[PDB]
Amino acid sequence: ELFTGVVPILVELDGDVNGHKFSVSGEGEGDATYGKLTLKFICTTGKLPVPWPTLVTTLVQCFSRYPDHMKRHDFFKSAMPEGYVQERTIFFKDDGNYKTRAEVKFEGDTLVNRIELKGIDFKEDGNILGHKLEYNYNSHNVYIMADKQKNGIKVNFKIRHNIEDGSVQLADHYQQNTPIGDGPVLLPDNHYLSTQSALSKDPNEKRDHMVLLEFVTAAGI
Amino acid sequence: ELFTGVVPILVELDGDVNGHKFSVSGEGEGDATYGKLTLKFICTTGKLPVPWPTLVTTLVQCFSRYPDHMKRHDFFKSAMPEGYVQERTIFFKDDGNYKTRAEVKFEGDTLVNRIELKGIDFKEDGNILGHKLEYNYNSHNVYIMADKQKNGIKVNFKIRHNIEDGSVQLADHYQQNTPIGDGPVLLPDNHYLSTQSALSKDPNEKRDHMVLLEFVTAAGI
């Protein structure tokens, strides 16, 4: 019953991409029982140097709806409330790469996801730094597998960001999660997470930001 | 100022696919100024014979946010409140096809979209009738062009529905819209509509249904 109700969420990211330093603070709430996520992110350091869509996977998979018969495969919720470290190496096809480390744990009533991001090799003529990506999102299947030795899971999927000239920027994701505590955690059978995401703005919001709504449901078992 | 506020929406579809007759009633509201759409659809004839995702494009493009400098390209809103007839021939790659005719007009305070759908050639072993499609949606760019002679627009795009085995069902859309009134309507320059859609369920909803949230913004000018 840690996630049985609507849980408040706080996201804090400090990043660095080709020297361009910035920060993003996010607020929202998620309903696990429904896999619904509702968040708002403001770029507290001015104008975001990178497209908002490229930070979507970075800025809380524990809010996924795991159907009843899969509750024994929910590593995310089983690491709570102590948490898990989420690391990723995301490769933007024919452009730079992001390296992010984040710890997502409960801090009282709020589920907090603190992250650090470093991105490099981004061409200044590229989609990413060129800001040639459209403000929208597709739906992908996120693949999970247990990592026995490390006592976590290995996750992996490819994101397809849309470019304004009907092209598609691919972004390969290499993700790993380990619990932060020493208590046993649920190591799951192979399965994926079907996730849908939608980006919108906010009229009454003056600062640079992104509104993100997202639905996630576990499957493959 | 017909669409300046939140407008209520009513969708009514009666369909026939390979003989399987059914009806879908939908309710919701849209905010044009924001391009946000929020609708809920119930299958009033029992269990929907076709996957809910295949009816998404069928079940009100006048709720798109047309940035200020494009208000002269908004055919949809310029046909109001009298309306427009929206016809489509959608071809499901390697499977059947849908033929839908719908009139969408204002009926008092509510924007009503009444539709008739006939689908044929759907293989019983196919994705569609086989219900092998996942309950989710991608984002596509809907292409508009004026149709001088007919006094409307020709619209066209391809939808990529996801299949549970990481495949992609393509669905070619051939759409045409003509005003219902004889007053002059705005014929637009070529441009597209960037649309994002997300499907979800509803806990307190017992009947067969689909919850659809959708963001649309005009571009290409």
Short mmCIF file of all heavy atoms in Angstrom, two decimals, chain A residues 34 134-141 143 160 162-164 166 192 194-200 203 213 215, chain B residues 34 134-141 143 160 162-164 166 192 194-200 203 213 215:
data_model
loop_
_atom_site.label_atom_id
_atom_site.label_comp_id
_atom_site.label_asym_id
_atom_site.label_seq_id
_atom_site.Cartn_x
_atom_site.Cartn_y
_atom_site.Cartn_z
N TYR A 34 -3.24 2.67 -11.75
CA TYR A 34 -3.74 3.00 -13.08
C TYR A 34 -2.62 3.21 -14.11
O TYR A 34 -2.88 3.27 -15.32
CB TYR A 34 -4.65 4.21 -12.97
CG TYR A 34 -5.80 3.94 -12.01
CD1 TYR A 34 -6.12 4.82 -10.98
CD2 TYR A 34 -6.54 2.75 -12.12
CE1 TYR A 34 -7.15 4.54 -10.07
CE2 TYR A 34 -7.57 2.45 -11.22
CZ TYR A 34 -7.87 3.35 -10.20
OH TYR A 34 -8.92 3.06 -9.34
N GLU A 134 10.39 17.58 -33.06
CA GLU A 134 9.03 18.05 -32.78
C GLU A 134 8.63 17.73 -31.35
O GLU A 134 8.96 16.67 -30.82
CB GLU A 134 8.02 17.44 -33.74
CG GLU A 134 7.84 18.17 -35.07
CD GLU A 134 7.09 17.34 -36.08
OE1 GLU A 134 7.72 16.51 -36.77
OE2 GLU A 134 5.85 17.47 -36.14
N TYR A 135 7.80 18.59 -30.78
CA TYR A 135 7.36 18.42 -29.42
C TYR A 135 6.27 17.37 -29.31
O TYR A 135 5.09 17.69 -29.11
CB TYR A 135 6.91 19.78 -28.86
CG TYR A 135 6.57 19.80 -27.38
CD1 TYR A 135 7.56 19.92 -26.42
CD2 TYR A 135 5.25 19.80 -26.96
CE1 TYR A 135 7.26 20.04 -25.08
CE2 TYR A 135 4.92 19.92 -25.60
CZ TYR A 135 5.94 20.04 -24.67
OH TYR A 135 5.64 20.12 -23.32
N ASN A 136 6.64 16.11 -29.45
CA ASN A 136 5.67 15.03 -29.31
C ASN A 136 6.35 13.71 -28.98
O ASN A 136 7.58 13.58 -29.12
CB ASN A 136 4.74 14.92 -30.54
CG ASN A 136 5.45 14.52 -31.84
OD1 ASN A 136 6.59 14.07 -31.85
ND2 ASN A 136 4.72 14.63 -32.94
N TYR A 137 5.54 12.69 -28.69
CA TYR A 137 6.07 11.38 -28.34
C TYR A 137 5.29 10.17 -28.87
O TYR A 137 4.06 10.18 -28.92
CB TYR A 137 6.16 11.26 -26.82
CG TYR A 137 7.47 10.71 -26.32
CD1 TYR A 137 8.56 11.55 -26.11
CD2 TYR A 137 7.63 9.36 -26.06
CE1 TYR A 137 9.77 11.05 -25.65
CE2 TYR A 137 8.83 8.85 -25.59
CZ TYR A 137 9.90 9.70 -25.40
OH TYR A 137 11.13 9.20 -25.07
N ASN A 138 6.03 9.10 -29.13
CA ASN A 138 5.46 7.86 -29.61
C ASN A 138 5.31 6.89 -28.43
O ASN A 138 5.66 7.21 -27.29
CB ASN A 138 6.40 7.26 -30.66
CG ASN A 138 6.43 8.07 -31.94
OD1 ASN A 138 5.43 8.19 -32.62
ND2 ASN A 138 7.60 8.59 -32.28
N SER A 139 4.90 5.66 -28.70
CA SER A 139 4.73 4.66 -27.66
C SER A 139 5.69 3.55 -27.95
O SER A 139 5.88 3.21 -29.11
CB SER A 139 3.30 4.14 -27.66
OG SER A 139 2.40 5.23 -27.55
N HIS A 140 6.41 3.08 -26.94
CA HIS A 140 7.38 2.03 -27.16
C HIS A 140 7.22 0.99 -26.13
O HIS A 140 6.42 1.15 -25.22
CB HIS A 140 8.78 2.61 -27.09
CG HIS A 140 8.92 3.88 -27.86
ND1 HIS A 140 8.39 5.07 -27.43
CD2 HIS A 140 9.54 4.15 -29.03
CE1 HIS A 140 8.68 6.02 -28.30
NE2 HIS A 140 9.38 5.49 -29.28
N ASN A 141 7.86 -0.15 -26.34
CA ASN A 141 7.83 -1.24 -25.41
C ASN A 141 9.20 -1.31 -24.73
O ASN A 141 10.23 -1.34 -25.38
CB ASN A 141 7.51 -2.57 -26.13
CG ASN A 141 6.05 -2.67 -26.56
OD1 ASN A 141 5.74 -3.25 -27.59
ND2 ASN A 141 5.14 -2.11 -25.77
N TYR A 143 11.72 -3.17 -22.51
CA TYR A 143 12.09 -4.54 -22.16
C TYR A 143 12.92 -4.73 -20.93
O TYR A 143 14.06 -4.26 -20.88
CB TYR A 143 12.83 -5.17 -23.32
CG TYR A 143 11.92 -5.30 -24.49
CD1 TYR A 143 11.99 -4.41 -25.55
CD2 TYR A 143 10.87 -6.21 -24.47
CE1 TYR A 143 11.02 -4.40 -26.57
CE2 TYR A 143 9.90 -6.22 -25.48
CZ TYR A 143 9.98 -5.32 -26.53
OH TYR A 143 9.11 -5.41 -27.59
N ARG A 160 12.04 6.48 -30.65
CA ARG A 160 11.92 7.09 -31.97
C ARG A 160 11.39 8.49 -31.80
O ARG A 160 10.18 8.68 -31.64
CB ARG A 160 10.91 6.32 -32.83
CG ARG A 160 11.23 4.85 -33.05
CD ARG A 160 10.06 4.10 -33.69
NE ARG A 160 10.02 4.23 -35.14
CZ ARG A 160 9.32 5.16 -35.80
NH1 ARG A 160 8.57 6.04 -35.13
NH2 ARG A 160 9.37 5.21 -37.13
N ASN A 162 10.47 12.14 -33.31
CA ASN A 162 10.16 12.65 -34.64
C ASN A 162 10.83 13.97 -35.01
O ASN A 162 10.86 14.92 -34.23
CB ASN A 162 8.66 12.77 -34.87
CG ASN A 162 7.99 11.42 -35.04
OD1 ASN A 162 6.80 11.30 -34.77
ND2 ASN A 162 8.72 10.43 -35.55
N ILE A 163 11.35 14.03 -36.23
CA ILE A 163 11.99 15.23 -36.74
C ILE A 163 11.00 15.93 -37.68
O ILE A 163 10.33 15.28 -38.49
CB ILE A 163 13.29 14.91 -37.51
CG1 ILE A 163 13.94 13.63 -36.97
CG2 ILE A 163 14.26 16.07 -37.39
CD1 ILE A 163 14.33 13.72 -35.52
N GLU A 164 10.94 17.26 -37.61
CA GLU A 164 10.01 18.06 -38.42
C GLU A 164 9.97 17.79 -39.93
O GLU A 164 9.09 18.31 -40.62
CB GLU A 164 10.17 19.55 -38.14
CG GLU A 164 11.54 20.09 -38.48
CD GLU A 164 11.87 21.34 -37.70
OE1 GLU A 164 10.98 21.87 -37.00
OE2 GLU A 164 13.04 21.78 -37.78
N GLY A 166 9.58 14.82 -41.32
CA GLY A 166 9.13 13.43 -41.36
C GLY A 166 10.15 12.32 -41.11
O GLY A 166 9.88 11.14 -41.39
N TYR A 192 7.91 -6.84 -20.67
CA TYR A 192 8.16 -5.47 -21.09
C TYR A 192 7.10 -4.55 -20.49
O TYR A 192 6.17 -5.02 -19.78
CB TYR A 192 8.14 -5.35 -22.60
CG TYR A 192 6.81 -5.71 -23.20
CD1 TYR A 192 5.98 -4.74 -23.70
CD2 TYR A 192 6.37 -7.04 -23.23
CE1 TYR A 192 4.73 -5.06 -24.23
CE2 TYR A 192 5.14 -7.38 -23.78
CZ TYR A 192 4.32 -6.39 -24.28
OH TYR A 192 3.13 -6.72 -24.89
N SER A 194 4.62 -1.52 -21.65
CA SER A 194 4.06 -0.80 -22.78
C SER A 194 3.77 0.63 -22.31
O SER A 194 2.81 0.88 -21.55
CB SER A 194 2.77 -1.46 -23.25
OG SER A 194 2.18 -0.70 -24.29
N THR A 195 4.53 1.58 -22.82
CA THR A 195 4.36 2.94 -22.36
C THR A 195 3.97 3.97 -23.43
O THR A 195 4.61 4.06 -24.49
CB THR A 195 5.61 3.38 -21.55
OG1 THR A 195 6.34 4.38 -22.25
CG2 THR A 195 6.53 2.22 -21.29
N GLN A 196 2.98 4.79 -23.09
CA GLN A 196 2.47 5.83 -23.99
C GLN A 196 2.77 7.17 -23.32
O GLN A 196 2.53 7.34 -22.12
CB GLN A 196 0.95 5.67 -24.14
CG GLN A 196 0.42 4.27 -24.50
CD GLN A 196 -1.11 4.25 -24.64
OE1 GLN A 196 -1.67 5.01 -25.42
NE2 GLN A 196 -1.79 3.37 -23.89
N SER A 197 3.22 8.14 -24.10
CA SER A 197 3.56 9.44 -23.53
C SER A 197 3.07 10.60 -24.40
O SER A 197 3.07 10.49 -25.63
CB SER A 197 5.09 9.54 -23.38
OG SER A 197 5.62 8.33 -22.86
N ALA A 198 2.59 11.67 -23.78
CA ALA A 198 2.11 12.84 -24.53
C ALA A 198 2.61 14.14 -23.88
O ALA A 198 2.45 14.35 -22.68
CB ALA A 198 0.60 12.82 -24.64
N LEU A 199 3.22 14.99 -24.70
CA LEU A 199 3.77 16.26 -24.24
C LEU A 199 2.86 17.43 -24.58
O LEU A 199 2.37 17.55 -25.71
CB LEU A 199 5.12 16.51 -24.90
CG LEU A 199 6.02 15.31 -25.16
CD1 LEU A 199 7.34 15.80 -25.67
CD2 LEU A 199 6.22 14.49 -23.91
N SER A 200 2.66 18.32 -23.61
CA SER A 200 1.84 19.49 -23.87
C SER A 200 2.43 20.66 -23.11
O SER A 200 3.30 20.47 -22.26
CB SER A 200 0.38 19.27 -23.44
OG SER A 200 0.24 19.28 -22.03
N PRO A 203 -0.82 27.08 -20.64
CA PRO A 203 -1.16 28.49 -20.89
C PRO A 203 -0.72 29.45 -19.78
O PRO A 203 -0.02 30.44 -20.04
CB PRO A 203 -2.69 28.44 -21.00
CG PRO A 203 -3.09 27.20 -20.20
CD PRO A 203 -2.04 26.24 -20.65
N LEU A 213 2.15 13.79 -19.89
CA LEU A 213 1.20 12.85 -19.35
C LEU A 213 1.69 11.50 -19.88
O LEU A 213 2.12 11.40 -21.05
CB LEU A 213 -0.20 13.17 -19.81
CG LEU A 213 -1.12 12.04 -19.42
CD1 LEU A 213 -1.59 12.12 -17.95
CD2 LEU A 213 -2.25 12.06 -20.39
N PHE A 215 1.06 6.95 -19.71
CA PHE A 215 0.36 5.70 -19.31
C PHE A 215 1.28 4.52 -19.55
O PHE A 215 1.75 4.31 -20.68
CB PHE A 215 -0.91 5.46 -20.14
CG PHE A 215 -1.90 6.57 -20.02
CD1 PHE A 215 -1.87 7.62 -20.92
CD2 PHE A 215 -2.77 6.63 -18.94
CE1 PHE A 215 -2.70 8.73 -20.74
CE2 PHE A 215 -3.58 7.72 -18.75
CZ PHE A 215 -3.55 8.77 -19.65
N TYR B 34 -6.10 25.25 -26.95
CA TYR B 34 -5.00 24.44 -26.45
C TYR B 34 -4.77 23.16 -27.26
O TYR B 34 -3.75 22.48 -27.11
CB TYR B 34 -5.24 24.15 -24.98
CG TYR B 34 -5.36 25.44 -24.18
CD1 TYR B 34 -6.43 25.66 -23.31
CD2 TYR B 34 -4.42 26.47 -24.35
CE1 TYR B 34 -6.56 26.88 -22.62
CE2 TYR B 34 -4.54 27.69 -23.67
CZ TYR B 34 -5.61 27.89 -22.80
OH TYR B 34 -5.69 29.08 -22.10
N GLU B 134 -2.15 -3.70 -29.82
CA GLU B 134 -2.00 -3.21 -28.45
C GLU B 134 -2.79 -1.93 -28.24
O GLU B 134 -2.87 -1.07 -29.11
CB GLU B 134 -0.53 -2.95 -28.11
CG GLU B 134 0.25 -4.17 -27.61
CD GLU B 134 1.74 -3.93 -27.61
OE1 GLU B 134 2.38 -4.12 -28.67
OE2 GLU B 134 2.27 -3.49 -26.57
N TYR B 135 -3.26 -1.75 -27.01
CA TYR B 135 -4.05 -0.60 -26.67
C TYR B 135 -3.20 0.64 -26.47
O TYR B 135 -2.98 1.08 -25.34
CB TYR B 135 -4.91 -0.91 -25.44
CG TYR B 135 -5.92 0.15 -25.05
CD1 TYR B 135 -7.16 0.22 -25.68
CD2 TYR B 135 -5.68 1.01 -23.99
CE1 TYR B 135 -8.13 1.11 -25.28
CE2 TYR B 135 -6.66 1.93 -23.56
CZ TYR B 135 -7.88 1.97 -24.22
OH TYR B 135 -8.84 2.89 -23.84
N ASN B 136 -2.68 1.18 -27.55
CA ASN B 136 -1.87 2.40 -27.47
C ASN B 136 -1.82 3.14 -28.79
O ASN B 136 -2.19 2.58 -29.84
CB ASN B 136 -0.46 2.13 -26.89
CG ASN B 136 0.43 1.26 -27.79
OD1 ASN B 136 0.14 1.01 -28.96
ND2 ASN B 136 1.55 0.83 -27.22
N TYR B 137 -1.24 4.34 -28.77
CA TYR B 137 -1.15 5.16 -29.97
C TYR B 137 0.14 5.95 -30.15
O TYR B 137 0.72 6.47 -29.19
CB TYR B 137 -2.32 6.14 -30.01
CG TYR B 137 -3.03 6.20 -31.34
CD1 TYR B 137 -4.05 5.31 -31.65
CD2 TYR B 137 -2.69 7.16 -32.29
CE1 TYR B 137 -4.70 5.36 -32.87
CE2 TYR B 137 -3.34 7.23 -33.50
CZ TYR B 137 -4.34 6.32 -33.79
OH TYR B 137 -4.91 6.30 -35.04
N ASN B 138 0.52 6.14 -31.41
CA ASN B 138 1.70 6.89 -31.78
C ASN B 138 1.28 8.31 -32.19
O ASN B 138 0.10 8.66 -32.17
CB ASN B 138 2.38 6.19 -32.96
CG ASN B 138 2.99 4.87 -32.58
OD1 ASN B 138 3.91 4.82 -31.77
ND2 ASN B 138 2.52 3.79 -33.19
N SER B 139 2.23 9.11 -32.65
CA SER B 139 1.94 10.47 -33.06
C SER B 139 2.26 10.56 -34.53
O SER B 139 3.23 9.98 -34.97
CB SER B 139 2.80 11.46 -32.27
OG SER B 139 2.61 11.24 -30.89
N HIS B 140 1.37 11.17 -35.31
CA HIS B 140 1.60 11.26 -36.73
C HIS B 140 1.33 12.65 -37.18
O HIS B 140 0.90 13.47 -36.39
CB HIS B 140 0.67 10.31 -37.45
CG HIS B 140 0.64 8.95 -36.83
ND1 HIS B 140 -0.01 8.70 -35.64
CD2 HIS B 140 1.16 7.77 -37.23
CE1 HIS B 140 0.11 7.42 -35.34
NE2 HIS B 140 0.81 6.83 -36.29
N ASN B 141 1.73 12.95 -38.40
CA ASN B 141 1.52 14.24 -38.99
C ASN B 141 0.42 14.09 -40.05
O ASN B 141 0.50 13.23 -40.93
CB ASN B 141 2.82 14.79 -39.62
CG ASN B 141 3.83 15.24 -38.57
OD1 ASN B 141 5.03 15.11 -38.77
ND2 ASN B 141 3.36 15.79 -37.46
N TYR B 143 -1.55 15.51 -43.01
CA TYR B 143 -1.37 16.44 -44.13
C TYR B 143 -2.60 16.96 -44.81
O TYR B 143 -3.35 16.17 -45.41
CB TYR B 143 -0.50 15.79 -45.18
CG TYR B 143 0.87 15.55 -44.64
CD1 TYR B 143 1.26 14.29 -44.22
CD2 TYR B 143 1.72 16.62 -44.39
CE1 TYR B 143 2.47 14.09 -43.53
CE2 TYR B 143 2.93 16.44 -43.71
CZ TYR B 143 3.30 15.17 -43.29
OH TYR B 143 4.55 14.97 -42.74
N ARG B 160 0.28 4.14 -37.85
CA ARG B 160 1.08 2.99 -37.46
C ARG B 160 0.55 2.44 -36.16
O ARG B 160 0.87 2.96 -35.09
CB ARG B 160 2.54 3.40 -37.22
CG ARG B 160 3.24 4.05 -38.40
CD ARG B 160 4.58 4.66 -38.00
NE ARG B 160 5.67 3.69 -37.99
CZ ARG B 160 6.07 3.02 -36.91
NH1 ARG B 160 5.47 3.20 -35.73
NH2 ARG B 160 7.06 2.13 -37.02
N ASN B 162 0.47 -0.42 -33.29
CA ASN B 162 1.41 -1.43 -32.83
C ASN B 162 0.81 -2.81 -32.55
O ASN B 162 -0.24 -2.94 -31.92
CB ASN B 162 2.19 -0.97 -31.60
CG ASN B 162 3.22 0.09 -31.93
OD1 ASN B 162 3.59 0.88 -31.05
ND2 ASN B 162 3.75 0.08 -33.15
N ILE B 163 1.52 -3.84 -33.01
CA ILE B 163 1.09 -5.21 -32.80
C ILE B 163 1.93 -5.80 -31.65
O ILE B 163 3.15 -5.58 -31.60
CB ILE B 163 1.27 -6.07 -34.06
CG1 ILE B 163 1.14 -5.21 -35.33
CG2 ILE B 163 0.23 -7.19 -34.09
CD1 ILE B 163 -0.19 -4.54 -35.47
N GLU B 164 1.30 -6.58 -30.78
CA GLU B 164 1.98 -7.17 -29.62
C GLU B 164 3.29 -7.91 -29.86
O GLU B 164 3.98 -8.28 -28.90
CB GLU B 164 1.01 -8.01 -28.79
CG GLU B 164 0.44 -9.19 -29.54
CD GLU B 164 -0.88 -9.66 -28.97
OE1 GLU B 164 -1.28 -9.16 -27.89
OE2 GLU B 164 -1.52 -10.52 -29.61
N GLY B 166 5.89 -6.71 -31.50
CA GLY B 166 6.74 -5.64 -32.02
C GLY B 166 6.61 -5.24 -33.49
O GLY B 166 7.48 -4.54 -34.03
N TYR B 192 0.32 20.73 -42.20
CA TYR B 192 -0.08 19.48 -41.57
C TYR B 192 -0.51 19.75 -40.13
O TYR B 192 -0.44 20.90 -39.64
CB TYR B 192 1.06 18.47 -41.59
CG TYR B 192 2.26 18.93 -40.82
CD1 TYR B 192 2.57 18.37 -39.60
CD2 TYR B 192 3.08 19.96 -41.31
CE1 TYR B 192 3.67 18.82 -38.87
CE2 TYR B 192 4.19 20.40 -40.60
CZ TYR B 192 4.48 19.82 -39.38
OH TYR B 192 5.63 20.19 -38.70
N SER B 194 0.10 18.21 -36.39
CA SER B 194 0.90 17.30 -35.59
C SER B 194 0.01 16.81 -34.44
O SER B 194 -0.28 17.56 -33.49
CB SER B 194 2.12 18.02 -35.03
OG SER B 194 2.85 17.15 -34.17
N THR B 195 -0.35 15.55 -34.48
CA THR B 195 -1.25 15.03 -33.47
C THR B 195 -0.71 13.90 -32.60
O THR B 195 -0.21 12.88 -33.11
CB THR B 195 -2.62 14.70 -34.11
OG1 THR B 195 -2.85 13.29 -34.11
CG2 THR B 195 -2.69 15.18 -35.53
N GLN B 196 -0.92 14.02 -31.29
CA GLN B 196 -0.47 13.04 -30.31
C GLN B 196 -1.72 12.46 -29.66
O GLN B 196 -2.64 13.21 -29.28
CB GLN B 196 0.38 13.73 -29.24
CG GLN B 196 1.53 14.64 -29.72
CD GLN B 196 2.31 15.26 -28.55
OE1 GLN B 196 2.81 14.54 -27.69
NE2 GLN B 196 2.41 16.60 -28.51
N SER B 197 -1.75 11.15 -29.47
CA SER B 197 -2.94 10.52 -28.88
C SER B 197 -2.56 9.46 -27.84
O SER B 197 -1.56 8.77 -28.00
CB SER B 197 -3.75 9.86 -30.00
OG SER B 197 -3.84 10.72 -31.13
N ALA B 198 -3.33 9.38 -26.75
CA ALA B 198 -3.07 8.39 -25.71
C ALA B 198 -4.37 7.74 -25.24
O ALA B 198 -5.33 8.42 -24.90
CB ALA B 198 -2.32 9.02 -24.54
N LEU B 199 -4.39 6.41 -25.24
CA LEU B 199 -5.56 5.63 -24.85
C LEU B 199 -5.43 5.09 -23.44
O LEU B 199 -4.39 4.53 -23.07
CB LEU B 199 -5.74 4.45 -25.79
CG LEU B 199 -5.38 4.65 -27.26
CD1 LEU B 199 -5.78 3.42 -28.02
CD2 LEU B 199 -6.07 5.85 -27.84
N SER B 200 -6.50 5.21 -22.66
CA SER B 200 -6.47 4.68 -21.31
C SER B 200 -7.85 4.14 -20.98
O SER B 200 -8.80 4.39 -21.72
CB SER B 200 -6.07 5.74 -20.28
OG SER B 200 -7.11 6.68 -20.06
N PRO B 203 -11.27 3.04 -14.28
CA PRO B 203 -11.56 2.14 -13.15
C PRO B 203 -13.05 2.02 -12.82
O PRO B 203 -13.60 0.91 -12.77
CB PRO B 203 -10.79 2.79 -12.00
CG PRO B 203 -10.69 4.26 -12.40
CD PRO B 203 -10.36 4.13 -13.85
N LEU B 213 -7.13 10.65 -24.81
CA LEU B 213 -6.71 12.01 -24.62
C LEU B 213 -5.90 12.32 -25.88
O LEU B 213 -5.13 11.47 -26.36
CB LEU B 213 -5.89 12.16 -23.36
CG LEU B 213 -5.28 13.54 -23.32
CD1 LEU B 213 -6.26 14.62 -22.79
CD2 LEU B 213 -4.04 13.44 -22.50
N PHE B 215 -3.70 15.63 -28.21
CA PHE B 215 -3.14 16.99 -28.42
C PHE B 215 -2.82 17.18 -29.88
O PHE B 215 -2.04 16.39 -30.46
CB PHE B 215 -1.84 17.20 -27.63
CG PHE B 215 -2.00 17.01 -26.16
CD1 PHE B 215 -1.79 15.77 -25.59
CD2 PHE B 215 -2.49 18.04 -25.37
CE1 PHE B 215 -2.07 15.55 -24.25
CE2 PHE B 215 -2.78 17.83 -24.04
CZ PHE B 215 -2.57 16.58 -23.48
#
